[PDB]
Amino acid sequence: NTTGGRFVDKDNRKYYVKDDHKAIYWHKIDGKTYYFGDIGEMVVGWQYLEIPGTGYRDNLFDNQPVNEIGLQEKWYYFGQDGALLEQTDKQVLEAKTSENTGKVYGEQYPLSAEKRTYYFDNNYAVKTGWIYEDGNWYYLNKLGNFGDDSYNPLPIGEVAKGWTQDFHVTIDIDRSKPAPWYYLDASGKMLTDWQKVNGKWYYFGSSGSMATGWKYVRGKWYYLDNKNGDMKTGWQYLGNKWYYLRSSGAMVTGWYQDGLTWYYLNAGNGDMKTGWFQVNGKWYYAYSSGALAVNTTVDGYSVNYNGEWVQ
Ligand SMILES: CN1[C@@H]2CC[C@H]1C[C@@H](OC(=O)[C@H](CO)c1ccccc1)C2
Ligand SMILES: CN1[C@@H]2CC[C@H]1C[C@@H](OC(=O)[C@H](CO)c1ccccc1)C2
Ligand SMILES: C[N+](C)(C)CCO
Ligand SMILES: C[N+](C)(C)CCO
Numbered sequence: 632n633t634t635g636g637r638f639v640d641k642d643n644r645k646y647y648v649k650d651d652h653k654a655i656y657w658h659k660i661d662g663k664t665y666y667f668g669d670i671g672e673m674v675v676g677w678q679y680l681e682i683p684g685t686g687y688r689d690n691l692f693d694n695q696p697v698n699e700i701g702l703q704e705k706w707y708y709f710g711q712d713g714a715l716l717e718q719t720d721k722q723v724l725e726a727k728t729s730e731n732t733g734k735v736y737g738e739q740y741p742l743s744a745e746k747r748t749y750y751f752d753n754n755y756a757v758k759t760g761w762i763y764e765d766g767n768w769y770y771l772n773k774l775g776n777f778g779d780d781s782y783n784p785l786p787i788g789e790v791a792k793g794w795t796q797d798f799h800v801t802i803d804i805d806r807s808k809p810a811p812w813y814y815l816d817a818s819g820k821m822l823t824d825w826q827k828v829n830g831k832w833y834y835f836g837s838s839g840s841m842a843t844g845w846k847y848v849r850g851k852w853y854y855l856d857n858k859n860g861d862m863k864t865g866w867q868y869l870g871n872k873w874y875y876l877r878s879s880g881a882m883v884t885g886w887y888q889d890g891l892t893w894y895y896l897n898a899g900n901g902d903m904k905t906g907w908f909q910v911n912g913k914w915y916y917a918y919s920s921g922a923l924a925v926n927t928t929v930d931g932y933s934v935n936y937n938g939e940w941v942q
């Protein structure tokens with residue numbers, strides 16, 4: 632909706648001038664959208680800019696006041712003639728790197744030899760977050776990189792690979808909300824169910840989120856590290872009780888013999904018994920270590936070869 636002006640080439644830069652003033656920021660001119668930055672230099676290619684449409688960075692000229700405003704920034708792609716690529720689905724484009732972004736018309740810069748598929752939201756900005764394609768989920772980075780006083784927005788919108796946390800984000804991470812972990816394979820596909828990664832097992836279920844703590848899967852109980860998620864095996868002291876997990880990871884219930892030593896894991900909960908207890912009417916005694924007392928005396932009580940209290 633910006634008319635009455637004209638594009639002007641000067642000092643190896645391109646401007647749009649009307650009534651003798653330079654256009655700045657976002658402008659819709661003759662069916663196309665352009666962006667002129669803070670001083671009027673038309674941009675081209677990959678750009679990380681404040682979102683258009685509010686009016687605070689729109690239809691402005693360098694002779695007008697520029698309001699202070701807090702607008703999130705997103706990635707946008709402009710043609711070599713400066714027109715905004717109004718894609719709302721996806722498109723194959725030169726990968727964005729530390730050398731082909733933030734450039735303006737007139738500048739010299741290489742055209743990425745590598746091209747990637749980029750997804751877009753309904754407002755022409757590069758899409759971030761989860762996307763479902765051809766039977767699989769992929770995660771497009773919501774955040775860029777940091778590093779003690781430093782922020783690189785380049786990763787935003789790129790296909791995530793490997794271990795990835797899904798933070799709730801707008802302009803900054805939202806620490807109040809949960810941030811589950813996921814694992815994307817070499818091609819970015821989200822893994823589900825059991826998966827062996829770096830030598831350890833993890834359970835991602837059907838949603839993809841990495842489970843932590845006790846987890847019931849296909850009839851058996853498993854215990855994933857409460858913080859890191861890796862599946863535990865063997866004897867585990869959890870919540871002040873002992874549990875025995877098979878090498879497969881499944882929790883054991885009932886009688887279990889380790890070498891010559893018998894142990895009794897509670898029928899339902901699975902916690903190890905100590906002291907006197909009875910199974911199917913018969914009484915047995917387990918020491919504090921959980922080991923069953925056999926062929927000996929326990930406080931004036933005889934227990935035979937099977938640990939049974941012999942009357
Ligand atoms: C990005 N460069 C181009 C536009 C600004 C800078 C420097 C050049 O532009 C200028 O030098 C401007 C043109 O009006 C200028 C300012 C003051 C004195 C002379 C020229 C090319
Ligand atoms: C390490 N355990 C976990 C993964 C394999 C074993 C047993 C359980 O997994 C399975 O039982 C199934 C059997 O098909 C399985 C899933 C994924 C890979 C291999 C086996 C939990
Ligand atoms: C998109 N999901 C299946 C991947 C993850 C939960 O939001
Ligand atoms: C699974 N991790 C990302 C969560 C933790 C350490 O490897």
Ligand SMILES: C[N+](C)(C)CCO
Pocket residue numbers: 845852899900901
């Ligand atoms: C999950 N349980 C049955 C295994 C243990 C108590 O938390």
Ligand SMILES: C[N+](C)(C)CCO
Pocket residue numbers: 907914932940
């Ligand atoms: C069975 N008792 C007589 C042995 C022991 C207390 O429960």
Ligand SMILES: C[N+](C)(C)CCO
Pocket residue numbers: 866873920921
């Ligand atoms: C782990 N314990 C309690 C089970 C057995 C003695 O080492």
Ligand SMILES: C[N+](C)(C)CCO
Pocket residue numbers: 886893923937938
């Ligand atoms: C299960 N036991 C302790 C009970 C008996 C030997 O098989």
